[PDB]
Amino acid sequence: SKQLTFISAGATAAVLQSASAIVSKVAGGRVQTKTAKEAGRHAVVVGPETPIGVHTAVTEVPKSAQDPLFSGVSTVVVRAVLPRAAPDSVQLRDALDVYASAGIDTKEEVRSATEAFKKSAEVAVGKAKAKGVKRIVLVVKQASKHNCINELFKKISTETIESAGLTTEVVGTAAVANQLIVNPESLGVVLLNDVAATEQIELAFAGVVGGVSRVYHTVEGGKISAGHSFKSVALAVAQELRELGLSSEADKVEAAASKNPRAVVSAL
Amino acid sequence: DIMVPSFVYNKLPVIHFLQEKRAEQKLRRVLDETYTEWTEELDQAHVTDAITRSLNI
DSSP states (O other): OEEEEEEESSOOHHHHHHHHHHHHHHHTTSEEEEEESOOSSSEEEESSSOOTTEEEEEEOOOSTTOOSTTTTOOOEEEEEOOOOOOSSSOOHHHHHHHHHHHTOOOHHHHHHHHHHHHHHHHHHHHHHHHHTOSEEEEEOOOOSTTSSHHHHHHHHHHHHHHHHTOEEEEEOSHHHHHHHHHOGGGOSEEEEOSOHHHHHHHHHHHHHTTOOOEEEEETTSOEEEEESSHHHHHHHHHHHHHHHTOHHHHHHHHHHHHHOSTTHHHHO | OOHHHHHHHHHHHHHHHHHHHHHHHHHHHHHHTOOOOOOOOOOHHHHHHHHHHHTTO
16 A cells, blocks of 8 residues: 655665665555655655755664664764766766856756755754854865865855854864764764765765664655665665555664664574 | 039049049948957866866876
């Protein structure tokens, strides 16, 4: 009756097959599992690549799945995601910086980027207010190539955050990544500009913590789960089942993920 | 038969000269309005750079 939408973005067939087996064995057939390329709700996206239709890329440190090394840490990493076009077409994150060099008009693209940053900034400040932190950390790659997209990102993110009344501290990519992996307790809320390096940093943090499920906020309004490994996908499915209104099944999947990461399907 | 013909004959040279000058003026105006339109086209180096960026390199 109900439907779970599986999106594949750069994920090996093994992970997708594992996810399908897990849901089928745990759900028992009550909720069907259909595959697609875009969704707004009841969706799990497998693979490092960012799907189409997501504007925010928040991720946290769930208490249940905290690794013993990272016990007690509490930091929220939100990556701003610009609208994604077809693979052949030039992405906005690159168009916004190259068209300016080429002299092409960049009005509509700026407007679209501004809207995406505002939504991401609103999500980040809401998380910061909920956690109670007073200052957030913006992350922008300091490469000369990305001298326009980051500039707009800073101009808008700081504007929205300052309007909300919180402080912003701008930093690069290498220093923040090292701090987040080594001393993450000194960062409460960190926003990341839309760059490939930032995406890798988000994945590394999601994996080093012990394997977690990232939350994507889409344009249509909602939250969709995202995973890249067996444990992360298993946690993503468990959260998705919990959202559908299944508590016991979600707990079983979470327990199986904690015990046997690479073979949860057989473990449960 | 006599008078108007003579005055027409007297008119002929000046009118011929003025009409030749007018034709030369027309040709000169035609020539002066010709300009070569050198257009500028987007350098392909930027296109190559965008292609590289899209590859995530």
